[PDB]
């Protein structure tokens, strides 16, 4: 049955270390049982019985105090049978990552945090740690990944994020990661407010 469930993450897919995140499988299709599968360092499948509200079948899976094994690509399967466990098509993937495992990076704005409309803004992620890649986040829920430049004479590993001509303003944060552990990120950079006047 190629009817896929939907997978959400409350509060968000970026969960700090040793904190709890609620992964919700919901669908207009009536499902009596739900299966949550993770791909990563430690692959596991979780089951929760389905709850029925209005015409929506939903289950709030609980991913406990965040640790390395609980991070990865999550896909939710659906079922109405239990002993057969006839599995639906996989949900659209959701990458749950753990933050706060490394030192925070430094986020800077050139020309500056506050800028006039139409003026190009470029945000720079820098850290003395050897982060192989940096992640830019606006309002918490965002994903812009660029590879990082290596050891500068300054000793900083840096990546430049071109925001382009400025029409919107938001609160941007930076995260650092290593290529070996893709779903394990660093502490958030000190938030940088981009304002367009």
């Amino acid at each position: 049955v190629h009817r896929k469930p939907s997978l959400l993450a409350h509060p968000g897919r970026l969960v700090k270390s040793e904190e709890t995140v609620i992964l919700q499988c919901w669908s207009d299709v009536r499902f009596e049982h739900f299966l949550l599968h993770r791909e990563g360092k430690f692959k596991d499948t979780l089951h929760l019985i389905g709850e029925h509200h209005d015409g929506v079948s939903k289950a709030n899976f609980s991913i406990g105090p965040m640790m390395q094994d609980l991070a990865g690509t999550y896909r939710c399967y659906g079922s109405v049978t239990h002993s057969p466990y006839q599995l639906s098509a996989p949900s659209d993937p959701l990458d749950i990552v753990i933050t706060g495992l490394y030192e925070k990076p430094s986020l800077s704005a050139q020309p500056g945090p506050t800028v006039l409309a139409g003026e190009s803004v470029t945000l720079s992620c820098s850290s003395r740690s050897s982060y192989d890649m940096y992640h830019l986040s606006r309002e918490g829920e965002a994903h812009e990944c660029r590879f990082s430049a290596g050891p500068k004479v300054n000793g900083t590993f840096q990546a430049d994020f071109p925001l382009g001509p400025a029409t919107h303003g938001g609160t941007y944060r930076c995260f650092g990661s290593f290529r070996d552990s893709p779903y394990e990120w660093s502490n958030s950079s000190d938030p940088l407010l981009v304002s367009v006047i």
Epitope: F42, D44, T45, I63, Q68, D69, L70, S83
Partner: antibody, heavy 123, light 108 residues
Framework: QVQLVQSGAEVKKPGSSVKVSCKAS????????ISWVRQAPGQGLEWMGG????????NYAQKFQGRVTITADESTSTAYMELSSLRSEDTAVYYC????????????????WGQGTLVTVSS | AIRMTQSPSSVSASVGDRVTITCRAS??????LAWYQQKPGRAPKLLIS???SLQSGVPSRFSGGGSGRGFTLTISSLQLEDFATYYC?????????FGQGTKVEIKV
């Protein structure tokens, strides 16, 4: 009452391949997460890897990866573990066990164990 | 990756003396430590989960304590059925590692 039975003892020459079975009763095989633990003569207990509950994919340990393949057959309600290249260090008692989990995606230990299987390299 | 250091390696004990076994973790594992008992020939048996929670059918003399990186297993009054090798195992992160084991032996 979940119970696990294992294959018999095996005497194999160096470089051979051994396969051990783990038959489960008392519950649905799909619900179980079966891991494999090795007890060497001098060494203690080492987690080699285990199957994921429903799908049957196996998490492995780096030390044993490349020579160990862990599989499962839902029809037989049996889990399998295969050592590719047998060396004198591989000689040990190999156990299968069910890992029990609680809330939050955590597992807390191996509550049910098999009787163990003795593999022995050539003297 | 997480290394478990178990001490002591061996205990020469008689029936009735308190035996304390310690297990130190390389990094913080929270309360996610399990204590096992393996008698000769038979398979390991789970005695305590979540550092302190005892399984059913386990006598009250077995007690588990600790959190973070330091853990202890205390048998207040040893009995003849309690002479075996004891292991600690972490369940926090995928490379699940056991301790080297504590061999509680009958005193010569």
């Amino acid at each position: 009452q979940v119970q696990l039975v294992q294959s018999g003892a095996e005497v194999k020459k160096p470089g051979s391949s051994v396969k051990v079975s783990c038959k489960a009763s008392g519950g649905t095989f799909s619900s179980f997460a079966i891991s494999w633990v090795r007890q060497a003569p001098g060494q203690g207990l080492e987690w080699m890897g285990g199957i994921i509950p429903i799908f049957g994919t196996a998490n492995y340990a780096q030390k044993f990866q490349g020579r160990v393949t862990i599989t499962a057959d839902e029809s037989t309600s049996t889990a399998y573990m295969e050592l590719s290249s047998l060396r004198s260090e591989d000689t040990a008692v190999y156990y299968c066990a069910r890992v029990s989990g609680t809330t939050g995606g955590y597992y807390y230990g191996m509550d049910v164990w098999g009787q163990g299987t003795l593999v022995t390299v050539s003297s | 990756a997480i290394r478990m250091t178990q001490s002591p390696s061996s205990v020469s004990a008689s029936v009735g003396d308190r035996v304390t076994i310690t297990c130190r973790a390389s990094q913080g594992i929270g309360n996610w430590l399990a204590w096992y008992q393996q008698k000769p020939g038979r398979a390991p048996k789970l005695l305590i989960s979540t550092a302190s929670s005892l399984q059913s059918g386990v006598p009250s003399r077995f007690s588990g304590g600790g959190s973070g990186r330091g853990f202890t297993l205390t048998i207040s009054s040893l009995q003849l059925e309690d002479f075996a090798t004891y292991y600690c195992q972490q369940s926090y992160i995928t490379p699940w590692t056991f301790g080297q084991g504590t061999k509680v032996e009958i005193k010569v």
